[PDB]
Structure 1
Amino acid sequence: HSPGQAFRAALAKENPLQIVGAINANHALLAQRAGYQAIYLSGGGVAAGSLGLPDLGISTLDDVLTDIRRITDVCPLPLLVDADIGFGSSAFNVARTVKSIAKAGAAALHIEDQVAIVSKEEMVDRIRAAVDARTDPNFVIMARTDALAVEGLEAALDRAQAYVDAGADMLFPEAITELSMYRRFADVAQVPILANITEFGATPLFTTDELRSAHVAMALYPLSAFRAMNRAAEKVYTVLRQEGTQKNVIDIMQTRNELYESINYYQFEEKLDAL
């Protein structure tokens, strides 16, 4: 039943496993109804969406925990969580963070080597503090590297090896621009590799068939839905403010039955009927 076991189970059943970001509980339920087997909580999303703040280390662990509980309290899909760099320079912080996130209901989390990026040894220690704090061995500790933004592939691969040896269960190579690169991290790391297919990034919009050819274990789409959600919302605000009526925007609105079906409204009423 362990959410961590659920995540790993998802991986074994889907390759590459599509993991979509869910900005809130409602969207996690939509993703589930769409067929997805796992979801994601973006840190930049918590900041930009939940707090309306830029992703400049302004949001706190508590902001993230709150969204983790909301999402997992109602959606059973294993949730991968963006734990940034650990929320705290102290090892105690990295540890309290890992335990808090797991306790909030997350199935997995990824911690990065950013400060520019810290040294291999540094990250290796962070990873160790994380693996140590974990209680449920099935809970996934993913190690993310942003080395490709400031270093070369070879250097990034060197880290990838040290991060795995450090205990990292899976690898998250950021900003990969070539399909062949994914293959090299896989062959070198020997653990599941996640491809971050976020739009407006350096990484091309690879298809799942392309990622599969590169042995990619996971395809992540962190803010996709959020992005379309914002545009549609903005449209409603503009049209409504210009015409003094939302009449010409009704057509792009989820209906009552659709909303109700996504949140299992009828099922709740059913239980009441039974009484």
Structure 2
Amino acid sequence: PMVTAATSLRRALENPDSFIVAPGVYDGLSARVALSAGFDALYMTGAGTAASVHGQADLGICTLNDMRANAEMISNISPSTPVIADADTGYGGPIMVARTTEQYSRSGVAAFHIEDQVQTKKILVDTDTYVTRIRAAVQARQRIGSDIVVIARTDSLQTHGYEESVARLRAARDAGADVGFLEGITSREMARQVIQDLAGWPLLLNMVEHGATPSISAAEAKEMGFRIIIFPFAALGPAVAAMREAMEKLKRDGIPGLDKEMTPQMLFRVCGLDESMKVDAQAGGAAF
């Protein structure tokens, strides 16, 4: 039988000693680089999928199709490594939440977050309608015997302020969500409070540096009491800076002038050539 990295994530979350550190990846390449560096979890950023798949800002231009194709691909690079995937607002009503839940599960996604924003347009949907997306996800994975981890995100902080944020989290905890995600915590003090306010329920810190949140390392998050830290820009920021200074060097020099170690063979190795080659060798033949 098939196993998923949902089940080992779930099992690590039911354990108070485990802390999940998941760099933000957005494509095959970033996923391979992060895995080679020895990360035991990855986070598929939706801002990065929008940037890579469509070359757009994150304005809600990825469909279910895009987002699931990208999460399934990242989940199956290393199937025993948990992937936490953005799932925006679930791509419609409860029928669409269920469909997303089932498709992410079949794809081997370990966890996905679902938020309280309006599909289209930060504009928010009433709490009732939000818990409706939560319930439909929990019931969907329940129908298919899936251990996928439901993360409940709330984008209500700046809009409606701390207590309303904590209210909407608690409503989603009561409707079955496995983890809470307060977007844009504004101080270390608010991060300690929310751990205490939703005591005993796992929480996820979103660590995008240089924004509403002070810079909190993974050892410090763990000690404040979070259960997951994600860094959605760990790969994007570096990649964009280097591609820009590489492009400009090419435009000056007329040749990329890459280090003698960036052979194409090496980039196929980063992408698991050796493993493909033994998959081909094992089937008999041949081509290598």
Regarding TM over 0.5, the answer is yes
Q: Identity percentage over the alignment?
A: 33
Matched residue, 1:84 = 88
Matched residue, 2:125 = 118
Letter in 1 for 2:241: R
Separation in structure 1 between the aligned mates of residue 281 and residue 104 of structure 2, nearest angstrom: 37
After superposition, the CA RMSD in angstroms is 2.2
Worse overlay, 174-183 or 222-231:
174-183
Separation in structure 1 between the aligned mates of residue 82 and residue 273 of structure 2, nearest angstrom: 22
Separation in structure 2 between the aligned mates of residue 122 and residue 44 of structure 1, nearest angstrom: 24
Higher helix share: 1
Letter in 2 for 1:58: I
**Could you give the per-residue CA deviations for residues 176-221 of structure 1, whole angstroms, max 9, x where no partner exists?**
0222323333333331100000133211211123212310111110
CA deviation after TM superposition for structure 1 residue 64, in Å: 0.8
Separation in structure 2 between the aligned mates of residue 236 and residue 168 of structure 1, nearest angstrom: 44
The count of corresponding residues between Structure 1 and Structure 2 is 272
Q: Kindly indicate whether residue 139 of structure 2 is the aligned counterpart of residue 132 of structure 1.
A: yes
Gaps of 5+ in 1: none
Separation in structure 1 between the aligned mates of residue 161 and residue 76 of structure 2, nearest angstrom: 41
Match of 2:193 among 177, 184, 201: 184
Q: Contact 2:6–2:108 at 8 Å: present in 1 too?
A: no
**Could you give the per-residue CA deviations for residues 115-154 of structure 1, whole angstroms, max 9, x where no partner exists?**
2222222211110111111123421111001111212222
Is the alpha carbon distance of 1:26 and 1:127 closer, same or farther for their aligned partners in structure 2, counting shifts above 3 Å? same
Q: Contact 2:86–2:113 at 8 Å: present in 1 too?
A: yes
Gaps of 5+ in 2: none
Letter in 2 for 1:8: R
Q: Contact 1:81–1:109 at 8 Å: present in 2 too?
A: yes
Q: Kindly indicate whether residue 200 of structure 2 is the aligned counterpart of residue 198 of structure 1.
A: no
Q: Contact 2:105–2:146 at 8 Å: present in 1 too?
A: no
Q: Kindly indicate whether residue 4 of structure 2 is the aligned counterpart of residue 2 of structure 1.
A: yes
Match of 1:251 among 259, 279, 284: 259
CA deviation after TM superposition for structure 1 residue 259, in Å: 2.6
Secondary structure in 1 matching 2:152: strand
Q: Kindly indicate whether residue 43 of structure 2 is the aligned counterpart of residue 40 of structure 1.
A: yes
CA deviation after TM superposition for structure 1 residue 105, in Å: 2.1
Match of 1:241 among 245, 251, 258: 251
Secondary structure in 2 matching 1:81: strand
Q: Contact 1:193–1:216 at 8 Å: present in 2 too?
A: yes
Secondary structure in 2 matching 1:224: coil
Matched residue, 2:171 = 162
Secondary structure in 2 matching 1:171: strand
Secondary structure in 2 matching 1:150: helix
Q: Spell out structure 1 runs of 4+ moving beyond 3 A.
A: 9-16, 251-258, 267-275
Separation in structure 1 between the aligned mates of residue 107 and residue 190 of structure 2, nearest angstrom: 34
Is the alpha carbon distance of 1:103 and 1:206 closer, same or farther for their aligned partners in structure 2, counting shifts above 3 Å? same
Matched residue, 2:66 = 63
